[PDB]
Design a protein around this ligand. Structure first.
Ligand SMILES: [Mg+2]
Ligand SMILES: [Mg+2]
Ligand SMILES: [Mg+2]
Length: 759
DNA sequence: AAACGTACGCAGTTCGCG
DNA sequence: CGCGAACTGCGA
């Protein structure tokens, strides 16, 4: 099984390395024969002899064209004749390609920015993660000593914990009396012991949580200070940091560093993505969180450190368990895309589409379109198109609601109507499908490049979706649900890829065609259910809608809904299929993209509400949640009015714990690039002024105090909050935090909400 | 050296214009 | 002095 591929430079020549595990053995296969290349379209063949004399300089190396071959390929299906230019080293290509394109007889160049390792897997037809090979895994976490105003990793690592099938242990240089704790003398021994443990266990996969941005960068910095050669790799190398556009990733050569944070972030919708929230949201049991302040106090004073070591141990234990669960879903994602798990687990949805498209293009001998230059990239940003149809919600608290939606609206449209840039206005075509409103004709004679691949993706999703219900294990069922939904969004992002400014197969016409068809199909379904079946659509959004029969019983809504599905699915063509994905006792819809419904098992599902959004205090979230139960479950708005009256009373009488009045907002840039003043920006600019390190990603946890000025003037960080000297702004938390979210809810159900607050 | 799939949409905070 | 407008963060 192919784990990963890279290349090294041996005497000026690139050597591909294929890190494999076959028959329980780690293997490095070498390939000194693969040559980097890219293509060039020529005005005349005669120029090839003038082009191959073009040279360039690298880092003291004279880069020359090694070999050329004329090849016939297809560009968007139409045949084209390009010249394939070979080079010695892959870094020759970035050094020489602009000079080659600058030649007057060179129309354009192609496939010049493909990474050497990824190009190798594509051109050799190799697929990582294939085979039933079992992978050894070892998770690890670190616990550090931090103080405000300190540089990154200025203080030492206090604990290194690790966990596998043998159990979870903790290495630390203070005597903590626990059976799973190994005590050494200094931080240097603690690190060198952990390095020995990884060397002795030799795991194929190293699992972390945010190790790409914390655990590895911290270990790296501490290793340079203490002079430790952190030879984690199976080739003796140290962990290598890699820039991925905006943030950083860490690779360990020979192994797979599995950072669960990017994987979980895009697999589960959570308000926050702490390890405790993620663990509880998956396995059902809570996890205690120990913050850095209590860790520092326990270490410095020496009191209460067993609690810290148990948090460090749990950190490693639950990271290994989560890694066991989500490795299969990511291994399949690596097989589907055709790139190593390390890249697929962290890559953007954009490159997940493009890396598969590039592989399939090479299979069909399709010349890949380039990424746009600066002028075209900005032009694509300046252009947009109509999207999903959103209906203004019908006001009121409704009963006996069904939610119907398409199984995969946009991927259904792409395949059914052959939406593809190679089929767009393809002249000479016997039959086309024209999109409504936008009027783009799409050839139907041959399956388009992208539609020909979207089908297999959907067949995967339904293959996992069928195993989903057929698995009675709640854990394995929740995971297949996670995994089949990942494929749903992957296939849907193919439509969005058509509008991605950096997309090789960019097709604005394809994108707005898919949405125009989706708008026509969603409106047809709404119109049909209202005139032919007497339903009232209460809310609609892009791919689905809520509806009911006013004044009808629950049984006759379910029956007429199933009847309507038979009528509309026979009317709907191709792969378009409307689904029955829920009946709900009650529900309301406050605004576009903001709703709340409750099923027949009293389970409340919501969308777009302040409960799951950052920037609202817990006292606001908790009150809205309790108001949701009184309305959706009990149908008692007077209880909902009583709840908000109690909360506002406790706020006025200062009987609410200030821990519930903390607002969490994230800093998204350098504090200098802020055009406006805000509460969370004002605290960040004041903490940075006193020494605290603020950077893009820093969440500001603040609380608004009773004082003067704007809200930002009254806000302070919560760590600086002293209940003895500071009186929180009760009027703010009443009028600005608790009242607004429930006011809109009661107004949406048809209630004036008069005098919700206390006195 | 790759680099954020898309449009649609709400809403808190600030603050200058009639 | 209310009322958008800009800025800001993020949620099928
Ligand atoms: Mg790599
Ligand atoms: Mg655009
Ligand atoms: Mg049908």
């Amino acid at each position: 099984m192919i784990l990963d591929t890279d290349y090294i430079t041996e005497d000026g020549k690139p050597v591909i390395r294929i890190f494999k595990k076959e028959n329980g053995e780690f293997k490095i296969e070498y390939d000194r024969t693969f040559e980097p290349y890219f293509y060039a379209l020529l005005k005349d063949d005669s120029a090839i002899e003038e082009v191959k004399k073009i040279t360039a300089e690298r880092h003291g190396t004279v880069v020359t064209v090694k070999r050329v071959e004329k090849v016939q390929k297809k560009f968007l299906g139409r045949p084209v004749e390009v010249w394939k230019l070979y080079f010695t080293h892959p870094q020759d290509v970035p050094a020489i390609r602009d000079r080659i394109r600058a030649h007057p007889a060179v129309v354009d160049i192609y496939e010049y920015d493909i990474p050497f390792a990824k190009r190798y897997l594509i051109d050799k037809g190799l697929i990582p993660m294939e085979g039933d090979e079992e992978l050894t895994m070892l998770a690890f976490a670190i616990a550090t000593l931090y103080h405000e105003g300190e540089e990154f990793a200025e203080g030492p690592i206090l604990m290194i914990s690790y966990a596998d099938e043998e159990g979870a242990r903790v290495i630390t240089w203070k005597n903590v009396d626990l059976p799973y704790v190994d005590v050494v003398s200094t931080e240097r021994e603690m690190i060198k012991r952990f390095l020995r443990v990884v060397k002795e266990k030799d795991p194929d996969v190293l699992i972390t949580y945010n190790g790409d941005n914390f655990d590895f960068a911290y270990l790296k910095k501490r290793c340079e200070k203490l002079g430790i050669n952190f030879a984690l790799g199976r080739d003796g190398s140290e962990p290598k940091i890699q820039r991925m556009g905006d943030r950083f990733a860490v690779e360990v050569k020979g192994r797979i560093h599995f950072d669960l944070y990017p994987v979980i972030r895009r697999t589960i919708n959570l308000p926050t993505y702490t390890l405790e929230a993620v663990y509880e949201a998956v396995f059902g049991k809570p996890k205690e969180k120990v913050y850095a302040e209590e860790i520092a106090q326990a270490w410095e004073t020496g009191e209460g450190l067993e609690r810290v070591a148990r948090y460090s141990m749990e950190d490693a234990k639950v990271t290994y368990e989560l890694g066991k669960e989500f490795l299969p879903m990511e291994a399949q994602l690596s097989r589907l895309v055709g790139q190593p798990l390390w890249d697929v687990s962290r890559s953007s949805t954009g490159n997940l589409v493009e890396w598969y498209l590039l592989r399939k293009a090479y299979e069909r001998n399709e010349l890949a379109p380039n990424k746009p230059d600066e002028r075209e990239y900005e032009r694509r940003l300046r252009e947009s198109y109509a999207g999903g149809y959103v209906k203004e919600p019908e006001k009121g608290l409704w009963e006996n609601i069904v939610y119907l939606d398409f199984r995969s609206l946009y991927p259904s449209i792409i395949i059914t109507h052959n939406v593809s840039p190679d089929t767009l206005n393809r002249e000479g075509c016997k039959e086309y499908d024209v999109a409504p409103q936008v009027g783009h004709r799409f050839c139907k004679d041959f399956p388009g490049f992208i539609p020909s691949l979207l089908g297999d993706l959907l067949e995967e999703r339904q293959k996992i979706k069928r195993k989903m219900k057929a698995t009675v294990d709640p854990l394995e069922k929740k995971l297949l649900d996670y995994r089949q939904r990942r494929i749903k969004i992957l296939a849907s992002s193919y439509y969005g890829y058509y509008g991605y400014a950096r997309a090789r197969w960019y097709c604005k016409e394809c994108a707005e065609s898919v949405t125009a068809w989706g708008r026509q199909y969603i409106e047809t379904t709404i119109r049909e259910i209202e005139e032919k079946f007497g339903f009232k659509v209460l809310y609609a959004d892009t791919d689905g809608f809520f509806a009911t029969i006013p004044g009808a019983d629950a049984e006759t809504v379910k029956k007429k809904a199933k009847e309507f599905l038979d009528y509309i699915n026979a009317k709907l063509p191709g792969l378009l299929e409307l689904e029955y994905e829920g009946f709900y006792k009650r529900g309301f819809f406050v605004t576009k993209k903001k709703y709340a419904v409750i099923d027949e098992e009293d389970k409340i599902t919501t969308g777009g509400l302040e409960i799951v959004r950052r920037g609202w205090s817990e006292i606001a979230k908790e009150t809205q949640a309790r108001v949701l139960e009184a309305l959706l479950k009990d149908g008692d708005v007077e209880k909902a009015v009583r709840i908000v009256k109690e909360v506002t009373e406790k706020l006025s009488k200062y009987e609410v714990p200030p821990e519930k009045l903390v607002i969490h907002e994230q800093i998204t840039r350098d504090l200098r690039d802020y055009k406006a003043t805000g509460p969370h920006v004002a605290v960040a600019k004041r903490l940075a002024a006193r020494g605290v390190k603020i950077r893009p990603g820093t969440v500001i946890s603040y609380i608004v105090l009773k004082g003067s000025g704007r809200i930002g003037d009254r806000a302070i960080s919560f760590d600086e909050f002293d209940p003895a000297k500071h009186k929180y702004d009760a009027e703010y938390y009443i009028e600005n935090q608790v009242l607004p979210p429930v006011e809109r809810i009661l107004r949406a159900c048809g209630y004036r909400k008069e005098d919700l607050r206390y006195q």
